[PDB]
């Protein structure tokens, strides 16, 4: 009885690895080129009916919280936003001494001081001539420098860029695909809580289309759960960690900006044009969002039931509005039709639940100069959009934070807060992981090489 090693190539074995993933995008958007911030024109087309093939008898451990392909997706969006703004106007001559007065074009009692009508001097096509021009700015984008003289909010720190009026912030799905020699394993387990073995796992050519939606509280337009509402958290007992909630049935939110805004062109200088806001046609009204009271209440009823599993059958669950802080975390921030909304969600998160037709109108505010989440420094300026904006979206989950309280309280209070944008896509990449294929396994057999 003698035994010798044998070499087998093309052997199925893998190991968790770190690598660079490239993009694949559907060709449905190839026609009507335009331009996107995510630049899917260079993104290679995907293969129709990709090889989604099941793997039997295989147990694989996942961990969405230390997962790769989320840190490097974070960088991709940051870098993809940078090269979009590089070739666009630099509004360095825009902030000077303005002379603003309130807008009184039949305004409503809600929109009292929220709009300012400003006039300023700007260079003509010739550098030897100035001329007076005017534009409408929101109250959140100006400060007094006393009087009735103002300046733009964010040019004593940095300078803003004008998003070229062709780039389209509208997200489109993106498939993250691994190179040859690497594979992506997708967890098909229904009751997957983000950690531990996934007895139902498969390997796919690459991920489903993931639309990158930047949003705080109430992450939108995402993937829905399968049969129940899933509460996933890195550590439940730690109050400092967020709680990512994903519920199966979506609840519709209708957000509109009723004002019939108009767009005006102001010449910064030779070859430079600034897109301003001309006189508003019609009436003035606060922007708002709408959700059903019935649909929202039943969804919260499902979330509370699931929250009792990790917190106790006999426990009081309480919802309260945001704690307080920066405007981009105390409100539902999102982008709708090229404009940036900041919605007051106090009407959604206010309830108490004991263990034993109409809609919700939540008001919103608008900004033109935004401090970009990509960096603490550079901002950007969103040009006004012609007409009236209206977008319908799915709320597919929540981002919650539990208030810290002493033991024996018997009342757990949760607050909404989005903050980190890594959570927005960690809710979409919880299924996936990357491994490297490792052929050339050596085993013994009853065979000897010929001499």
């Amino acid at each position: 009885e003698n035994l010798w090693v044998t070499v087998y190539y093309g052997v199925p074995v893998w190991k968790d690895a770190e690598t660079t993933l490239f993009c694949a995008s559907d060709a449905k958007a190839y026609e009507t080129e335009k331009h996107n911030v995510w630049a899917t024109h260079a993104c290679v087309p995907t293969d129709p009916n990709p090889q989604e093939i099941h793997l039997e008898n295989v147990t694989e451990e996942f961990n969405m919280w230390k997962n790769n392909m989320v840190e490097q997706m974070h960088t991709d969006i940051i870098s993809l936003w940078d090269q979009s703004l590089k070739p666009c106007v630099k509004l360095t001559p825009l902030c000077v001494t303005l002379q603003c007065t309130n807008v009184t074009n039949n305004i409503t009692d809600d929109m009292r001081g929220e709009l300012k009508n400003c006039s300023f001097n700007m260079t003509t096509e010739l550098r030897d001539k100035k001329q007076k021009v005017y534009s409408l700015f929101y109250r959140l984008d100006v400060v007094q420098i006393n009087n009735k003289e103002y300046r733009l909010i964010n040019c004593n720190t940095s300078a803003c860029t004008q998003a070229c009026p062709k780039v389209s912030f509208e997200p489109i799905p993106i498939h993250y695909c691994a190179p040859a020699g690497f594979a992506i394993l997708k967890c098909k387990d229904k009751k997957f809580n983000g950690t531990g073995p996934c007895p139902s796992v498969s390997t796919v050519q690459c991920t489903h289309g993931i639309k990158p939606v930047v949003s705080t509280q109430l992450l939108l337009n995402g993937s829905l759960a399968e049969e129940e509402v899933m509460i996933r958290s890195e550590n439940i007992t730690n109050n400092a960690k967020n709680i990512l909630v994903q519920f199966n049935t979506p609840v519709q939110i209708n957000c509109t900006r009723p004002n019939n805004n108009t767009r005006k062109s102001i010449r910064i200088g030779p070859g430079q044009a600034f897109y301003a806001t001309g006189d508003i046609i019609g009436d003035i009204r606060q922007a708002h969002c709408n959700v059903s009271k019935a649909t929202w209440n039943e969804t919260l009823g499902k979330v509370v039931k699931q929250l009792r599993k990790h917190f106790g059958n006999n426990t009081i669950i309480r919802f309260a509005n945001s704690s307080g802080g920066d405007l981009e975390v105390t409100t539902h921030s999102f982008n709708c039709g090229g404009e940036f909304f900041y919605c007051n969600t106090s009407g959604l998160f206010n309830s108490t639940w004991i263990s034993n037709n109409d809609s919700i109108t939540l008001p919103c505010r608008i900004k033109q100069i935004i401090n970009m989440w990509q960096r603490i420094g550079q901002c950007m300026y969103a040009p006004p959009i012609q007409g009236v904006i209206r977008c319908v979206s799915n709320i597919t989950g929540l981002i919650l934070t539990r208030d810290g309280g002493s033991t024996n309280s018997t009342t757990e209070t949760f607050r909404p807060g989005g903050g980190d944008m890594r959570d927005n896509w960690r809710s979409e990449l919880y299924k996936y992981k990357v491994v490297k294929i490792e052929p050339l396994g050596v085993a013994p057999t009853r065979c000897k090489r010929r001499v």
Epitope: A240, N242, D326, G404, G419
Partner: nanobody, 118 residues
Framework: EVQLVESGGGLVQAGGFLELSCELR????????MAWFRQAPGKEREFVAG?????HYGEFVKGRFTISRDNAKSTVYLQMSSLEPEDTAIYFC?????????????????WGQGTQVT
């Protein structure tokens, strides 16, 4: 490895002046916001001041304290002025999970060792 190192060490009397410093080592400075928290003896953590792209101050500040960040040295500096006796507490430095500043302690994942200012 992310770590925060504090300074200041306040031993000044009433109506004093200090400058607490907090250096961020194992992470990008222009990716997160940093805020100062305070713990009087026998009490809970409270928000003092923080700044990412915009500064925020606590209610008890009343415009006495002032925060600033020098991205060159990756530090956040907290000016202290008109220190009343009730400021005696342990001033902590924390890094936010994002670029935005909250008033609750759930918005920060890394904390400083602490500085007892009396």
């Amino acid at each position: 490895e992310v770590q925060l190192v504090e300074s200041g060490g306040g031993l000044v009397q009433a109506g004093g002046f200090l400058e607490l410093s907090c250096e961020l080592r194992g992470s990008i400075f222009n990716q997160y916001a940093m805020a100062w928290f305070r713990q009087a003896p026998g009490k809970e953590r409270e928000f003092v001041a923080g700044m990412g792209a915009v500064p925020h101050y606590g209610e008890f500040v009343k415009g006495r304290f002032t925060i600033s960040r020098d991205n060159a040295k990756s530090t956040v500096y907290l000016q202290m002025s008109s220190l009343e006796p009730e400021d005696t507490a342990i001033y902590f430095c924390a890094r936010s999970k994002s670029t935005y500043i909250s008033y609750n302690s759930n918005g920060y994942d890394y904390w400083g060792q602490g500085t007892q200012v009396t």
